[PDB]
Amino acid sequence: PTSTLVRVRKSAATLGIAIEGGANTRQPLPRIVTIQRGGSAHNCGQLKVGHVILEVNGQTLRGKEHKEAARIIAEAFKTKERDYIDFLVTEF
Amino acid sequence: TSTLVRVRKSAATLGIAIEGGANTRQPLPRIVTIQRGGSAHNCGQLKVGHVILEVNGQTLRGKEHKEAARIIAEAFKTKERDYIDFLVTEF
């Protein structure tokens, strides 16, 4: 089990990932299940389908429901405070 | 992080629904339902959310879902003894 900090530059107008999961559901932490061609995640190259997102900009997603985890990721992508998102991901 | 759990064959069925296997969203079989009355329910140490890594020492890592299910079913069908051993993990 390896945790990797992946910096995704906001290179495109969209993030372009589909996430599945959150607390109290079958997949307990958000897992990347789709990466859309052309989006910021696809340009990164270090994000992969199957990666489980543990943290977003240092904010843990452990124990968060899906709606809240998606809100945190969407806010991190939208904010003009920085031109990137740090994801801490794992691949077990 | 990984725990050995011995499930006694206290009922005619194992009584679990599993989801997962290689090359799918959930890469290893995860227990998503435990049926009331089955062997898993009587165990008390198996939980929904547990991911099965091994069955009687046989790794499930890298196996596709149908093969992982076949291995578990075959292990449960044993007549030589009255239990099955799972190596499980939770996260």
């Binding site: 992969k48 389908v49 | 194992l14 679990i16 629904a17 599993i18 989801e19 090359n23």
Partner: peptide, 13 residues
């Protein structure tokens, strides 16, 4: 590279 993972299969045991 693989850009999607399909829903997992399910079995009742």
């Amino acid at each position: 590279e693989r850009l999607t993972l399909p829903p997992s299969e399910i079995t009742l045991l």
